[PDB]
Design brief:
The structure is a homodimer.
Chain A: E1 5-13, H1 20-29, E2 35-36, E3 49-50, H2 64-67, H3 72-88, E4 100-105, H4 111-123, H5 141-150, E5 156-157, H6 165-178, E6 184-191, H7 196-204, E7 234-242, H8 243-248, E8 255-264, H9 277-289, E9 299-301, H10 308-322, E10 330-332, H11 335-338, H12 345-359, E11 361-362, E12 385-386, E13 391-398, E14 402-409
Parallel strand pairs in A: 4-5, 4-6, 9-10, 9-13
Antiparallel strand pairs in A: 1-7, 1-8, 2-3, 6-7, 8-14, 11-12, 13-14
Bound molecules: N-(propan-2-yl)-1H-pyrazole-3-carboxamide (2 copies).
PDB class: transferase
Keywords: SGC - Diamond I04-1 fragment screening, PanDDA, transferase
Assembly: dimeric
Chain lengths: 412, 412
């Protein structure tokens, strides 16, 4: 019968920092992680900026020998997983290794590595493809490599649900524990899609902000002058743990994961319905799953991508789910500062949602200079807002019309 | 407690045929789907053959315009999904669409699309990349497009667990129904990695058979002369349905899904442990999940990839799990005929496992001319074997040491 699930460990790379604390200081201070991209020549691209992980040192985590075999998205996912597991204090043993699994996901996976090997194939021939091309590129190898390094023999898998990946990964890892398939899961996601194919592909769809002359002002969720999302890189990992297992070992508990919702829009490959009907169904699933009155919700970490259609669909969903209480809760998009980490978006934002509960503060939506038509909720414009937060909700929406909601609350 | 899950519809593209009954007919006749790959210059490649889908007409499923937007792996997934829903006779309504979801996965995803867009990018620059590049290439677009086409609003997600994807997708979909998160799921996997990157990538790891002179003899699981797996394309989809929901509408029930096991080897990125310790844990997990004794298992659809270490690990794992029953069960690799569909291997092999139950026949392991050291089990060499099958197992073991086992039982 269904067991309770708590957060005992968290880990992160983001455009704001190489761990959770540094990233969170940037969030509360309203700092942008967005800058012109330096790792490649983007002069032929319509977008030349994004949220890069600055100063990442893989040799804090892995031998340069192993690191060389792995796409940056895998390196990013391992760094976050390693932080989270260390932050948990949990020791892996023969007694518990079978009860500890991993679900670290990615939207796109090893596009950089696949691009570079594609260049080798075309310019030179097949004999120049890396022997590590497959194991070093495919999405399941964050889970695989983490399991190999730490000796985790529990459920081992990976989701790929586009910009929903991080939220789905965390939610389904909670269900693993809830239903007794595991007692501990490392769950979240990682993304590094800032290669020619990534920036070019989102560019070809005209989905990206082209504000190249003011990158820190580009991500402006619900602002009338928004012109698409800002592509960002990194990773979020959480240690999910059955409550009694956590209590037994005297774990520090950040918060409890009480609710998880999924829905499909069944609307469009890439566009949300204007009314946010699928997002509404998802949040209602998650709130019923948590046994909550919707009026208990204090803070929503929005998907808030800074696209015209996405941002307004989200307001519509929140107003429909929460009615008059829509005017009392605080909703913000930390994508205003981090940009959009795609498959890792739900993972870092799940961590921001927990830290909102720990510190009792709503992170700001920066750059919200002129809220758009109907964007008249508390969106925590410009500055972090100290306030009572017992229940925090984190929304993700993706291509395919795939929706995820996580519900966290304070644990005493 | 837990609801019961039955299979009411199945769909497939394989190297043996463009649907289930044509594929199954090839399986029971010991026909190979393996041949030199056409319309592709493989001169510089160490492997020149594989299992291609022959004569696929996407316009039986999609308009030419909608098909142009999607990678072959997505077209194949949609084909199997539409076949499976049609085969189930399910009628989607406003009263049930929120209870019907999709989990169709891929191991490798849109390599063919990535390859063709790399060609444009390198030669001409980013502005020649297709606008549909991203949504037409990401793994969750089979679930996405299927949900949009049929109006499915239930759980919408995609697994990517390398060669374990199909097994994990079906297993976790069965969980959704068992624990009341959905009443129906479409689950399975699709793959098309017979591009330069798939043949080249696997080729660079020397993981592939190079028997270019005799492509039909290349896949020879447990034969002393095997020299690696054969890369194959296609898809499997199953309609999973709660038992009472299936009985109420008078659905035709092929079989019951009674058990699902997961484990991680936590051993190596590409290599199984010699004793198959992880595959043994996963099979034990699956049997415990089913409430079944190892003695009650009659038929195993092996992973049986035709790799040196993989084949021998699976013999050890079966001997370990099944003790004095290990010789009484029949175990075959249908990969001897189909080759290895990677992420779709588990989907098509779940369907073959279900059909073994319907038809009371163990599919052959063809090319098993000289069993290797220790390969002394009933591996159904050369020809199909009619026999009593009440309980059938399907195993998948994948890169990162991720393992899946499905347990199916006759339903009467
Ligand atoms: C990512 C796209 C497909 N969807 C949204 O932005 C969205 C916002 C509210 N509901 N859905
Ligand atoms: C695909 C690799 C990682 N593993 C196997 O083939 C295998 C065989 C027995 N256990 N695992």
């Amino acid at each position: 019968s269904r067991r309770r699930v708590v957060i005992t460990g968290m880990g992160m790379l983001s455009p704001l920092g190489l761990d959770v604390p540094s990233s969170w200081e940037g969030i509360l201070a309203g700092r942008s992680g967005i800058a012109p991209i330096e790792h490649m020549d983007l002069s032929a691209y319509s977008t030349r900026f994004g949220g890069s992980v600055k100063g990442f040192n893989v040799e804090e985590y892995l031998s340069a020998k192993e690191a060389r075999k792995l796409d940056l998205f895998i390196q990013y996912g391992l760094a976050a997983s390693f932080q989270a597991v260390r932050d948990s204090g949990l020791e892996v043993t023969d007694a518990n290794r079978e009860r500890i699994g991993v679900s670290m996901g990615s939207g796109i996976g090893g596009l950089t590595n696949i691009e570079n090997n594609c260049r080798s194939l075309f310019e030179q021939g097949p004999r120049r493809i890396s022997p590590f091309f497959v194991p070093g590129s495919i999405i399941n190898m964050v889970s695989g490599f983490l399991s190999i390094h730490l000796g985790l023999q529990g459920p081992n898998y990976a989701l790929t649900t586009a910009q929903t990946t991080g939220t789905h990964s965390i939610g389904m890892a909670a269900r693993n524990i809830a239903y007794g398939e595991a007692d501990v899961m490392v769950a979240g996601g990682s993304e590094m899609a800032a290669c020619g194919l990534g920036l070019g592909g989102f560019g070809a769809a005209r989905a990206l902000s082209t504000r190249n002359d003011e990158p820190t002002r580009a991500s402006r969720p619900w602002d009338r002058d928004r012109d698409g999302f800002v592509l960002s890189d990194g990773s979020g990992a959480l240690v999910l743990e059955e409550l009694e297992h956590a209590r037994a070992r005297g774990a520090r508990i950040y918060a409890e994961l009480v609710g998880f919702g999924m829905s499909g829009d069944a609307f469009h490959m890439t566009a949300p319905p204007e009314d946010g009907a699928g997002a509404a169904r998802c949040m209602k699933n998650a709130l019923r799953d948590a046994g909550l009155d919707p009026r208990q919700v204090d803070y929503i970490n929005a998907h808030g991508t800074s696209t015209p259609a996405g941002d307004i669909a989200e307001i519509a969903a929140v107003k429909s789910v929460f009615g008059e209480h829509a005017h009392a809760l605080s909703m913000s998009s930390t994508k205003s500062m981090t940009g959009h980490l795609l498959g890792a978006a739900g993972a870092v934002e799940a961590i921001f949602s927990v830290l909102a509960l720990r510190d009792q503060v709503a992170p700001p939506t920066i750059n919200l200079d002129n809220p758009d038509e109907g964007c008249d909720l508390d969106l925590v414009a410009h500055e972090a807002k100290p306030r009572k937060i017992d229940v925090a909700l984190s929304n993700s929406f993706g291509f395919g019309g795939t929706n995820g909601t996580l519900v966290f609350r304070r644990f005493a």
